[PDB]
């Protein structure tokens, strides 16, 4: 569509494209550096995009867009969190749940996206 590259799905991509915090390929920000070949976003934007597509009434377009975005190999987002110590559950090559050292200050880190 105009925003994803018919109306409800298009509006999900619009909002996602206006994410306030993005990091281009090779960009350094927040003490991180994006080593992927495409832009990565804050996890809250990716979270809201995922939920928007899942709840969209244009269910067929949303299904294609969600799968395309989220199920690409090695997809990640960043956010501020206590230092990550491990993964509690992995499925299909993705961390579902992680653990942290709650006693150390929060720092920006990288997190797996969920499969759609």
């Amino acid at each position: 569509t105009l925003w994803c590259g018919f109306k409800h799905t298009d509006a999900c991509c619009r909002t996602h494209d206006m994410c306030p915090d993005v990091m281009s390929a090779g960009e350094s920000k927040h003490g991180l550096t994006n080593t992927a070949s495409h832009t990565r976003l804050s996890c809250d934007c990716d979270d809201k995009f995922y939920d928007c597509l899942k709840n969209s009434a244009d269910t067929i377009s949303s299904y294609f867009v969600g799968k395309m975005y989220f199920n690409l190999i090695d997809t990640k987002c960043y956010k501020l969190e206590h230092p990550v110590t491990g993964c509690g559950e992995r499925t299909e090559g993705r961390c579902l749940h992680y653990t942290v050292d709650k006693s150390k200050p929060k720092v920006y880190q990288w997190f797996d996206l969920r499969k759609y």
Partner: nanobody
Amino acid sequence: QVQLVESGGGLVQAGGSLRLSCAASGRTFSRYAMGWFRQAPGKEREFVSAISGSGGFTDYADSVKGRFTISRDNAKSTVYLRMSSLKPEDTAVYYCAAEGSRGSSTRLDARGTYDYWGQGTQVTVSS
């Protein structure tokens, strides 16, 4: 549209046991982690235990490890907290919580992971 219905609280003597249950409707139960939190009088709400959608991963607050056991039955859309060797300091309102829809990995002992909360069930442990 999801609703959480808790039960199993009550007034028990110290050393005793209870089993809380929380049944959840409105979406596919097995896709989401479920957690238990508690709030004692005058204290902040705190994490107690949580379990992943598959049941394969569980987490417990340090003060309840070895005494409490969380489990879930995805065919009944229900999560359980078996509470043994109860202490006076376990007195609190216990709240079931259901993980929000998210597009990235989540931490089970963070309150922000959960978007839906039960009204709670009172557990009082007397000595």
